[PDB]
Amino acid sequence: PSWPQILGRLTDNRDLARGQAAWAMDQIMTGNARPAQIAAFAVAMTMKAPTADEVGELAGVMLSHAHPLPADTVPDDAVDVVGTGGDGVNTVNLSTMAAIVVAAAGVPVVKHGNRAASSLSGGADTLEALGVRIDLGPDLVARSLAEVGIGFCFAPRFHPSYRHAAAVRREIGVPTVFNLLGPLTNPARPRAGLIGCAFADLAEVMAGVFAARRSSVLVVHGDDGLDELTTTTTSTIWRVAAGSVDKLTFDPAGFGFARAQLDQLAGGDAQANAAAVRAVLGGARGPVRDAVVLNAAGAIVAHAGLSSRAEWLPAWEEGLRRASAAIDTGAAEQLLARWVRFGRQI
Ligand SMILES: COc1cccc2c1cc(C(=O)O)c1c(C(=O)O)cc3c(c12)OCO3
Ligand SMILES: COc1cccc2c1cc(C(=O)O)c1c(C(=O)O)cc3c(c12)OCO3
Ligand SMILES: O=P(O)(O)OC[C@H]1O[C@H](OP(=O)(O)OP(=O)(O)O)[C@H](O)[C@@H]1O
Ligand SMILES: [Mg+2]
Ligand SMILES: [Mg+2]
């Protein structure tokens, strides 16, 4: 296999042969690819229309190189709440806030995350500003998960070999298939997730990757563009269970949610977004709480889907009760405090 062969096949608008995407990602991850080759590959794959098989190969290589968590430290029902980013909206950190709430409801959360790429403050940035340790290695993440109920896998800590691809990703500015890989490469490999995708035309492919792994995942794209379940309008959900993908449209109005405006969800710097987390966890009502509860509920629905018995509407009703209760009882607020204390005590 070679760069001219793979790039030629992609530029000819052909799906790659089995193993080719994997070979390429492996070249990229082993420092053997020129930035020009990485960029050509990312761009060519994106414009060809990536297949689930191809993206799966990419994510598989990354996982094969990632730092794993210690044996038997991640429960079978752990969940992730993470998105591609790239929605261009600069919101409050909805996935991060939802993840705290989900963990406080008693669902084990191992969240994959990163700093901002285009937004003013990404999940990792806001967590850091809240006093949460984002730098923990495999052993200490496993401990955070066991002791606090949530661990955060900072992508750079667990995927050091991806630095070459990351550089190119940042240099070229344009979203590509690489923008899908974060949510697909949680090194703890949780089997459930609420997974945001900013790119409507790539969400189905993301869902196919999770389907191949037999994860229970809702891949979500707000019809306003959010890489989250939105409250401003409907969201498209690619529902993954039992190895197949179902496309659904989701309407919060069905659950008594009032329509919000996008600017009601707007974010600021790390300090402002940290303040927004504190506000929601302290019981402040309004648009941000609503979107947090909705997304927390969706992650709980993904978790419910790990069972073959799971029913969609009962799961949403239970997810919503559980997310609201986790905030209202103070569990979410306390969990954050305990998470901060945990990190200060290593
Ligand atoms: C130094 O910057 C980094 C170090 C290690 C990893 C990553 C990284 C940057 C990005 C990124 O550019 O956002 C990134 C992304 C992404 O969303 O592109 C996805 C990933 C990553 C990384 O590893 C897991 O899957
Ligand atoms: C928590 O409840 C769930 C979580 C995740 C997925 C599903 C789900 C429930 C149902 C369901 O309505 O029994 C469901 C159905 C269905 O049987 O209509 C079909 C699917 C699904 C799901 O994902 C792939 O295609
Ligand atoms: O700068 P952007 O490309 O727009 O990305 C914004 C954040 O979105 C993704 O994280 P994540 O979904 O984990 O959560 P946060 O905003 O939602 O809570 C990404 O890793 C960034 O941290
Ligand atoms: Mg998000
Ligand atoms: Mg977002």
Swiss-Prot record:
Keywords on record: Amino-acid biosynthesis, Aromatic amino acid biosynthesis, Glycosyltransferase, Magnesium, Metal-binding, Transferase, Tryptophan biosynthesis
Binding annotation for anthranilate 1: G83, N114
Entry keyword annotation includes Iron: no
Binding site for anthranilate 2: R169
Molecular function in Gene Ontology: anthranilate phosphoribosyltransferase activity; magnesium ion binding
SUPFAM superfamilies: Nucleoside phosphorylase/phosphoribosyltransferase catalytic domain, Nucleoside phosphorylase/phosphoribosyltransferase N-terminal domain
Enzyme class: transferase
Catalytic reaction annotation: N-(5-phospho-beta-D-ribosyl)anthranilate + diphosphate = 5-phospho-alpha-D-ribose 1-diphosphate + anthranilate
Residues noted as binding Mg(2+) 1 in the record, renumbered to the chain: S95, E228
Pathway field: Amino-acid biosynthesis; L-tryptophan biosynthesis; L-tryptophan from chorismate: step 2/5
Keyword ATP-binding annotated: no
Source species, domain of life: Bacteria
Protein family membership: Belongs to the anthranilate phosphoribosyltransferase family.
Listed name of the protein: Anthranilate phosphoribosyltransferase
Source organism of the structure: Mycobacterium tuberculosis (strain CDC 1551 / Oshkosh)
